Each structure stands twice: as structure tokens, then as C-alpha cells.
Design a protein around this ligand. Structure first.
Ligand code: FHD
Ligand code: ZN
Length: 200
């Protein structure tokens, strides 16, 4: 009830990226934990951004975010309604859909965007926060099975990452693991078509 001392939630902060530009996928950190904490409070992030898949953090969580069609997309259960830190201060979400577990901000300057897939292909690849590339067979509009199941520990922190087609187009955004006794046999993802509808 004391408004003058009510606190403000910090911004989402880009702290690294999954580098996919060469022949080897690998994670890069671009900001450490203390600098992340400070940037979240100010919302002012002057670091150079590169690539399609960002590693992002709040004070309490770390996950991924993926640029498609000039929008940096991630999951509501990671970002909530938070702004993203940018060189000129905090930037408000331009998309928020809790029913899809989806949020989006204008893509940061220097990022590159994935192209939405139009291949109609069911052989997919999930990219994790550790830069593992996981073959996934599409099993429905929003589900795919891991060819080699992994404990959910392996996937934790990768929500907001992409599922890609063989040509590197974006097919969806990783949302939740389909888990049996702690083993992820399948994944739930936000189809790129759903992003495109949200954009309209
Ligand atoms: C392991 C990595 C997975 C990608 C990941 N995702 C999650 O953990 C999401 C968050 C939440 O699901 C949701 N929460 C929502 C919350 C909302 O408002 C608050 C609005 C909409 C929401 N819609 C969903 Cl679906 C639960 N869950 C699951 O995966 C669960 N499985 C599940 O429920 O399966 C059924 C559903 C489909 C198949 C059944 C698990 C935990 C495995 C038992 C991950 O990495 N997260 S994270 O980066 O570590 C992180 C926590 C730091 C962010
Ligand atoms: Zn494609």
C-alpha cells in the first residue's frame, strides 16, 4: 500500500548468443552476472548484438530468444511483461500473448533474423542454450519427438530457442518439454505460423 517504495521489475538482458554462423555451433557469453544485474535495473544495454539466437536473463531466470521477421521472440514464462534492455533504455514488448506463452520485442540493431519456413518438412533441429543441435521429428502442429531422448536437465533454459528445418528456416519456438520420469521424449513448440498470426 506504500506506493513510493514500490519496486520495479528489471528488464530482460541479452547476456550472450548461440553462434551458428560457421561450421560449429557454440555458445558465447557477452555479459557477466554483475553487469547483467546492473543492466536489468537501468534498462540501458550498449553491448553489440549479433546473430539470430540470443541468451537472455532476468534477475531470476535465464533462457533464449530468437529473431524471426525482425522481432526478437521468447516465452512469457521467462520474460513475463518485462521490457528488454537496449542502447537507448528499456523497450516495451510489441507482442504479448500469455495464451501462447509468447512475447516479442523489436529485434535489436545488429541481430539477424531467421526466415519463416515454407518447406512443409518434418525433419527438424532444436538448438539449445549449450549450442547442442538436437534432431527432432515433427509429430503435429506443435509437437516433435527427440530422435534421442535426453533428461530434461539437458533442455532446461532453452525455452525461446528455435526449431529449424534442414535449410535453416525457423519452424517454431521451443516452449515446453514433454517429459516422462524426467526424460524428454518430445518437445512442445510455438509454430512460426502462430507468430505470424500474432504479428497481424
Ligand atoms: C525443460 C525445458 C523446457 C523448455 C522449458 N519450458 C518449461 O519449463 C515450461 C514452462 C511451463 O510451461 C508453460 N508455462 C506457461 C506460463 C505462462 O505464464 C506464466 C503462460 C503460458 C505457459 N505455457 C507453458 Cl507450456 C512448464 N514447462 C515445461 O516444460 C514442463 N512441461 C510441460 O508442461 O509439458 C506440458 C505442456 C506441453 C506438453 C505437455 C516441464 C517443466 C518439463 C514439466 C524451459 O527451458 N524453461 S526455462 O528456460 O528453463 C525457464 C523456466 C526460465 C524460463
Ligand atoms: Zn524450411
Amino acid at each position: 500500500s506504500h506506493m513510493a517504495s514500490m519496486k520495479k521489475k528489471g528488464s530482460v538482458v541479452i547476456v550472450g548468443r548461440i553462434n551458428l554462423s560457421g561450421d560449429t555451433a557454440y555458445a558465447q557469453q557477452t555479459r557477466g552476472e554483475e553487469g547483467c544485474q546492473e543492466t536489468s535495473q537501468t534498462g540501458r544495454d550498449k553491448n553489440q548484438v549479433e546473430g539470430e539466437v540470443q541468451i537472455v536473463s532476468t534477475a531470476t531466470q535465464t533462457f533464449l530468444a530468437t529473431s524471426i521477421n525482425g522481432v526478437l521472440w521468447t516465452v512469457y514464462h521467462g520474460a513475463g511483461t518485462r521490457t528488454i534492455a537496449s542502447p537507448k533504455g528499456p523497450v516495451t514488448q510489441m507482442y504479448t500473448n500469455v495464451d501462447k506463452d509468447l512475447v516479442g520485442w523489436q529485434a535489436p540493431q545488429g541481430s539477424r533474423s531467421l526466415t519463416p519456413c515454407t518447406c512443409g518438412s518434418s525433419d527438424l533441429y532444436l538448438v539449445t542454450r549449450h549450442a547442442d543441435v538436437i534432431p527432432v521429428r515433427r509429430r503435429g502442429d506443435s509437437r516433435g519427438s527427440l530422435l534421442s531422448p535426453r533428461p530434461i536437465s539437458y533442455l532446461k533454459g532453452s525455452s525461446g530457442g528455435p526449431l529449424l528445418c534442414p535449410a535453416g528456416h525457423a519452424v517454431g519456438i521451443f516452449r515446453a518439454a514433454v517429459c516422462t520420469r524426467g526424460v524428454a521424449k518430445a518437445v512442445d513448440f510455438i509454430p512460426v505460423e502462430s507468430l505470424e498470426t500474432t504479428m497481424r
